[PDB]
Amino acid sequence: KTSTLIRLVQLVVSFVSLWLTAAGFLHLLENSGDPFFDFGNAQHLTYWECLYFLMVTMSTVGFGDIFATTVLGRTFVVIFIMIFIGLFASFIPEIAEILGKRQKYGGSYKKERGKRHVVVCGYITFDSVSNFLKDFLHKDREDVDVEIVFLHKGLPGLELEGLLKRHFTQVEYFWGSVMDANDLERVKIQEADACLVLANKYCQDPDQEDAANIMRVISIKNYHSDIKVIVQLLQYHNKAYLLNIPSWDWKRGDDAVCVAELKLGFIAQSCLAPGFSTLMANLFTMRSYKPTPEMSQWQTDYMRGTGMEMYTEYLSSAFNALTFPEAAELCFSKLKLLLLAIEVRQEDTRESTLAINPGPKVKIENATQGFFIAESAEEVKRAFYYCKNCHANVSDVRQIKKCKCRP
Amino acid sequence: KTSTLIRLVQLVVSFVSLWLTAAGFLHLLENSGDPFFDFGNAQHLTYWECLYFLMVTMSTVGFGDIFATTVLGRTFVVIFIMIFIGLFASFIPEIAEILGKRQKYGGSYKKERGKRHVVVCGYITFDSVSNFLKDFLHKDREDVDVEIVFLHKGLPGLELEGLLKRHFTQVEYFWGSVMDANDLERVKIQEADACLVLANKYCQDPDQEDAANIMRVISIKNYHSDIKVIVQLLQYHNKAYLLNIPSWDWKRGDDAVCVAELKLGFIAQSCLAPGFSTLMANLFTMRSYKPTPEMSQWQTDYMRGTGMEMYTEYLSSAFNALTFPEAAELCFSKLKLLLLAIEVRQEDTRESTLAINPGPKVKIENATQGFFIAESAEEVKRAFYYCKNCHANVSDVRQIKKCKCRPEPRKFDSTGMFHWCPDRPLNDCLQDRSQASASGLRNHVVVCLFADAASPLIGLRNLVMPLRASNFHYHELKPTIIVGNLDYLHREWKTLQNFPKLSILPGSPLNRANLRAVNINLCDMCVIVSAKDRNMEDPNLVDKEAILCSLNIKAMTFDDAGANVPLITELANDSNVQFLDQDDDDDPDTELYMTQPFACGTAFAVSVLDSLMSTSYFNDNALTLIRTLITGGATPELEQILAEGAGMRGGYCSPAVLANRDRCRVAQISLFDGPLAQFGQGGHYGELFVYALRHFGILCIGLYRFRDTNESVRSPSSKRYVITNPPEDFPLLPTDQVYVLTYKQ
Ligand SMILES: [Ba+2]
Ligand SMILES: [Ba+2]
Ligand SMILES: [Ba+2]
Ligand SMILES: [K+]
């Protein structure tokens, strides 16, 4: 069911048929004889041997084992060579065109039983993926591994090919688009964990790119209506077009990331407090502390603070009926851990608006969620396992990491 | 007589001559001897054998039977190989170029004795031919087969090649143009039945394409002056340039099909009666009813009405001296057949103007022609063979198929068919949000226009002209408000200033403040049109604005609700209809006419109009009837008036002209609380039809019915679908609506 395959099979079948016809012609003309010599020079020649000889002659190689002694055989060989060279002169271009037509990056993704993947569509180039790939597949992240399935309408460049080859065990690529209900089955969106729509930050008209990304979101939500979508927008007024999509529910994970809003917000916060942009940019990126002797003292001091990230954790029962300043002081002094924000309304079930540095009025209740700044996720667990009675006399922070006499 | 052939024969002859010269050289140098050896090593060698050996050596193959023992022979062979390889290095490019020069699609068409063909010229691509080819070569059509001969200046693509191969037995292709008197003899226009000139609906400047098509028509009529031509135009003002051609006679079959006029007429008729666009689009396309078990009940009910077409037939002698209502009632009750229109003046020989649902005054005379809606052409024949005496006691309709024993200061136009107002400047109608909200607009029409400043004109006149017909009372006129770009409206206002009750709100339709000021929740129809240029990007990203506007209007909430706003969307690509409705199940190879948005009368695409070229060829009265239905007038006299460049003109009319204010119009009625509401409960379609025809003089075309079967609870998706001419035993519901053809205003 392919025109190229049909043409290829047609030409190969015609070539085989003509080759067999020529083999029969030579067999007859060699086993018959010569009218000039009254058929006194005919030489025995099997059909297989004649076919072998003609394949040798046609393949431009030429051997000296079988030759046409008969004059009729010689002139038939000359006609064979001339006609087949003439045909091959007008036959190689179509074959060359067809042999370089099948796309390299087809096929359908096959998922394992216990492996989750996220689909990454949109504007896939080297500069729009390198940082995202570096953060997504960072070594310092937890042991949970999730695959990445790029789905783009185009062929990757050289450096993108290098990135794909280096991450061969975690990254797959496919040719297609999110505008086709057929391409959304090759990447298994019905079972995908999330869909990430990237954008082109250096386009000519931001409105057109934003509309295209909104159309991609519309298509994805039209195919499957309960998947989590993270969109990358350019302008801020286009953030309201995503509320019109009936299946776009913010409460279940759908998010929109506005480039201009975040960038100018970082700059405007640097205006009020200089140096805040780098603080914010380093708190929200996965980095590891690897000091080297070639680094100056201030470089080491800065790199130590660079490697700290932000995490979330459920406060233990020891924080109940305790105000925010006391909880933060206890976390810093004992657990050596900084607490920024809390969940204030996890009890009344009203979306639990975040509270950043609340006053003494706010009190920690049961099963609240807090936000910590820590070097790694392991250190945050001490807040969950902290019991006041058993850990009263514990000095080293390496012992609080383990629970004690939990009910 | 070809330069390429001359070059080829020159090179092959030179090669043969050089080959023979080399053969002679080797023969002489081998049979002579060697001066160093005193000619003591010469070996006998015939000329034929030497020629064979040199052909083997030159052909890069190489055998080991004949070899040049002589040193002179060996050095001559070396020189031969070197010189001929050097020559062949500089000889293959020209040969390769020449061998790929002859065009594949030349030649002349040869016609059989009894086969007729139609020539199809113009803009031949895959998307402009697929629907036309599907309709023209439909299986359900009669046994008469006519060939198609495409004539284009270019090579077909891949999918066009596939179409040609699939229809190999009915379709031919040729390279040429209708601008050459030589190419019109290769396709035999002197014997062709008709010439179909297609257009490019998505061009950059419609005027240039229209002028090119007019030039093609001029050439075709210049070559042969008595051939039938069906032209496909884009704008409406170019329809008057075809009257200047001396050989263009409308009375003999020449026709012009205007894309914009028909499309905007369908939309404007949907504005008055929702869901009419799909009814009209399905009545004028060849379809077949092939139900499948996977289809839902409402899908089968809709597909049964989809398969009905329209035909013409001569009424039998039994209809003589019988008025139109009685004839229609007899046709429906006995023959199970619906009669729409009649020929009123076939006797006086005055072009026999069509009559749609005439009053009791009109009487059927001998040898009249009538128009029927029927599943197939066989059922229409019962009208011709119906004899009252012999078929009096015939119950089954399968026996009638065989014959038996046959022997107020109102200002209108000059034509008096449209409402007219004196010319005004644009600022006399321009408004802002405060002024628009001050005016309590309700039951109006809102046109959301996504136009640029330099975008080509749509011709919004064709959308407002049907809404100002003179058969509407001045208090029944629906106010129209256009929300869109302003510079485009400066360009467009030249053709709109004469229509009363029209307003413009500059801005953008995607803004919500405009839609709140316009009172879009109290309107009767919101038409989303886009004048922006088409097809510079992915085909799936050409209808961003329309889909975004539809979703924005649907998601909006008003104060007593935004999902009940009736709006009709115009699509550039027909594959985007999957993104309009959420409750439906999408599918990639489903035709547009079978989707849910189209079945409800919400989406419309110009592709469904591609089938209007074939029908106009097979039925010459179809275009007149469809224009009469979807335009509300526009007689050729009005076209002549507009062709003078002075614009629309008129005023107070004489009483003789004002007699044109009584033509029938398409309307929609409800079975809820009217005088005929008794058929809502337990009633059947046939009883309602005959009652309405006998009592009120109303002809019913079809039903417009809630999609959800549980209308008692009225599921949130309150969408309706259309059924065309349901059978006589169809059960009615109190919430169903009926399409009707009303008379006497
Ligand atoms: Ba770290
Ligand atoms: Ba049919
Ligand atoms: Ba859908
Ligand atoms: K070679």
Beta strands in B224-319 (DSSP E): 228-233, 255-258, 309-314
Structure-block tokens of residue B209: 């394409």
Q: Any bridge partners for residue B666, and if so which?
A: B741
Cβ-based neighbour number of residue A207 at 10 Å: 13
The resolution in Å comes to 2.9
- Contact call for residues A194 and A253 (beta carbons, < 8 A): yes
- Contact call for residues A176 and A153 (beta carbons, < 8 A): yes
**DSSP code for B1:** -
Q: Which residue of B has its CA nearest to A68?
A: B65
Please indicate if the annotation marks A313 as binding a ligand: no
**DSSP code for B501:** S
Q: State the sign of the Cα–Cα–Cα–Cα dihedral B652, B657, B659, B663.
A: negative
β-pairing, B146-152 vs B171-175, is parallel
Distance from CA of A57 to the nearest CA of B (A): 7
Structure-block tokens of residue A126: 């080297």
The H or E element spanning position B548 is: helix B544-555
Please indicate if the annotation marks B369 as binding a ligand: no
Burial class, B395, CB count within 10 angstroms (exposed 0-12 / middle 13-18 / buried 19+)? exposed
β-pairing, B445-450 vs B480-484, is parallel
Q: Which residue of A has its CA nearest to B563?
A: A246
Inform me whether the C-beta atom of residue B25 falls under 8 Å from chain A C-beta atoms. Answer: no
Q: Tokens 């979508």 sit at which residue?
A: A229
**DSSP code for B568:** E
Residues 6+ apart with CB under 8 A from A198: A120, A121, A122, A123, A124, A128, A129, A132, A232
Q: Residues B70, B73, B74, CA angle at the centre, nearest 5°?
A: 90
The 3-state DSSP class for residue A257 equals strand
What are the C-alpha distances in Å from B329 to residues B323, B479, B684, B698, B738?
A: 10, 37, 16, 11, 18
Rounded Cα gap, residues B680 and B673, in angstroms = 9
Residues 6+ apart with CB under 8 A from A390: A404, A405
Of B99, B578, B582, the CB nearest to A246: B582
Q: Which residues of B264-302 are buried (b: 16+ CB within 10 A; e: fewer)?
A: bbbbbbbbbbbbbbbbbbbbbbbbeeeeeeeeeebbebb
Q: Residues A329, A335, A338, CA angle at the centre, nearest 5°?
A: 55
Amino acid at residue number B306: T
Q: State the sign of the Cα–Cα–Cα–Cα dihedral A221, B267, B535, B158.
A: positive
What are the C-alpha distances in Å from B5 to residues A85, A91, B11, B104, B534?
A: 20, 20, 10, 16, 44
Question: Please, after which residues is chain B broken with C–N above 2.5 Å?
Answer: 407, 560
Which among A223, B113, A221, A222 is positioned nearest to A231, based on CA atoms? A221
Ramachandran angles phi, psi of A165, nearest 5°: -70, -40
Rounded Cα gap, residues A249 and A226, in angstroms = 9
Inform me whether the C-beta atom of residue A262 falls under 8 Å from chain B C-beta atoms. Answer: no
Which among B404, B71, B457, B539 is positioned nearest to B261, based on CA atoms? B457
Cβ-based neighbour number of residue B530 at 10 Å: 25
Of A64, A89, A212, the CB nearest to B63: A64
- Contact call for residues B291 and B303 (beta carbons, < 8 A): yes
Q: How far is CA B67 from the centre of its chain?
A: 74
Q: Do B544 and A64 touch (CB under 8 A)?
A: no
Rounded Cα gap, residues A35 and B196, in angstroms = 63
Rounded Cα gap, residues A368 and A350, in angstroms = 14
Q: State the sign of the Cα–Cα–Cα–Cα dihedral B253, B254, B257, B261.
A: negative
Inform me whether the C-beta atom of residue B52 falls under 8 Å from chain A C-beta atoms. Answer: yes
Q: Tokens 């009883």 sit at which residue?
A: B687
Please indicate if the annotation marks A222 as binding a ligand: yes
Structure-block tokens of residue B651: 């005023």
- Contact call for residues B234 and B263 (beta carbons, < 8 A): no
Q: Any bridge partners for residue B740, and if so which?
A: B667, B700
- Contact call for residues A355 and A345 (beta carbons, < 8 A): no
Nearest-10 crossing angle of helices A71-89, B92-99: 70
Q: State the sign of the Cα–Cα–Cα–Cα dihedral A73, A75, A78, A83.
A: negative
Q: Do A222 and B578 touch (CB under 8 A)?
A: yes
Rounded Cα gap, residues A314 and A320, in angstroms = 12
Q: Tokens 């009469």 sit at which residue?
A: B628
Please indicate if the annotation marks B140 as binding a ligand: yes
Interface of A with B in 66-105 (CB under 8 A): 67, 71, 74-75, 78, 81-82, 85, 89-90, 93
Q: How far is CA B635 from the centre of its chain?
A: 22
Q: Tokens 């005929």 sit at which residue?
A: B676
Distance, first Cα to last Cα, chain A: 66
- Contact call for residues A199 and A123 (beta carbons, < 8 A): yes
Rounded Cα gap, residues B458 and B439, in angstroms = 28
- Contact call for residues A200 and A128 (beta carbons, < 8 A): yes
Q: State the sign of the Cα–Cα–Cα–Cα dihedral B71, B77, B80, B81.
A: negative
- Contact call for residues B670 and B732 (beta carbons, < 8 A): no
Which among A322, A264, A122, A182 is positioned nearest to B588, based on CA atoms? A182
Strands across the sheet with A146-152, in order?
A171-175, A146-152, A116-121, A194-197, A228-233, A255-258
Rounded Cα gap, residues A250 and A230, in angstroms = 11
Question: Please, after which residues is chain A broken with C–N above 2.5 Å?
Answer: none
Cβ-based neighbour number of residue B722 at 10 Å: 26
Q: Do A64 and B60 touch (CB under 8 A)?
A: no
Of B49, B552, B579, the CB nearest to A218: B579
Q: Which residue of A has its CA nearest to B584?
A: A222
Rounded Cα gap, residues A370 and A362, in angstroms = 13
Distance from CA of A259 to the nearest CA of B (A): 22
Rounded Cα gap, residues B441 and A269, in angstroms = 48
Rounded Cα gap, residues A82 and A91, in angstroms = 14
Structure-block tokens of residue B275: 């869901």
Taking only Cα atoms into account, the Rg of chain B, rounded to an integer number of angstroms, comes to 35
Please indicate if the annotation marks B484 as binding a ligand: no
Residues of A in contact with B540 (CB under 8 A): 177, 179, 215, 219
Q: Do A244 and B551 touch (CB under 8 A)?
A: yes
Rounded Cα gap, residues B377 and B379, in angstroms = 6
Rounded Cα gap, residues A266 and A285, in angstroms = 15
What's B614-672 look like in SS3? Answer: HHHHHCCCHHHHHHHHHHCCCCHHHHHHHCCCCCCCCCCCCCCHHHHCCCCEEEEEECC
Which among B601, B525, B602 is positioned nearest to B565, based on CA atoms? B525
The H or E element spanning position A82 is: helix A71-89
Inform me whether the C-beta atom of residue A219 falls under 8 Å from chain B C-beta atoms. Answer: yes
β-pairing, B720-724 vs B699-706, is antiparallel
Which ligand has the minimum distance to the alpha carbon of residue A289? 1
Q: Any bridge partners for residue B231, and if so which?
A: B197, B256
Structure-block tokens of residue A246: 């009936």
β-pairing, B338-343 vs B480-484, is unpaired
β-pairing, A369-374 vs A363-364, is unpaired
Residues 6+ apart with CB under 8 A from B737: B668, B669, B670, B671, B703, B704, B705, B720
β-pairing, B363-364 vs B322-323, is antiparallel
Ramachandran angles phi, psi of A86, nearest 5°: -60, -40
Structure-block tokens of residue B22: 């080399």
Which ligand has the minimum distance to the alpha carbon of residue A283? 1
**DSSP code for B731:** B
Q: How far is CA B159 from the centre of its chain?
A: 20
Rounded Cα gap, residues B513 and B507, in angstroms = 10
The size of chain B, in residues, is 745
Residues 6+ apart with CB under 8 A from B476: none
Rounded Cα gap, residues B562 and B553, in angstroms = 7
Burial class, B671, CB count within 10 angstroms (exposed 0-12 / middle 13-18 / buried 19+)? buried
The 3-state DSSP class for residue B300 equals helix
Q: Any bridge partners for residue B92, and if so which?
A: none
Which among A405, A242, A385, A220 is positioned nearest to A319, based on CA atoms? A385
Please indicate if the annotation marks B232 as binding a ligand: no
Amino acid at residue number B439: S
Beta strands in A287-379 (DSSP E): 309-314, 322-323, 338-343, 354-356, 363-364, 369-374
Q: Residues A126, A127, A131, CA angle at the centre, nearest 5°?
A: 100
Residues 6+ apart with CB under 8 A from B101: B4
Ligand 1 centroid–CA A308 distance in Å is 5
Q: Do B96 and A78 touch (CB under 8 A)?
A: no
Instruction: Please tell me the experimental approach by which this structure was elucidated.
Output: cryo-EM
Ligand 1 centroid–CA A287 distance in Å is 5
Rounded Cα gap, residues A307 and A309, in angstroms = 6
Q: Do A214 and B544 touch (CB under 8 A)?
A: yes
Which among A251, A252, A212, A218 is positioned nearest to A235, based on CA atoms? A212
- Contact call for residues B338 and B331 (beta carbons, < 8 A): yes
What are the C-alpha distances in Å from A94 to residues A99, B92, B313?
A: 9, 17, 55
Residues 6+ apart with CB under 8 A from A13: none
Structure-block tokens of residue A377: 């996720």
Amino acid at residue number A136: F
Q: Do B63 and A60 touch (CB under 8 A)?
A: no
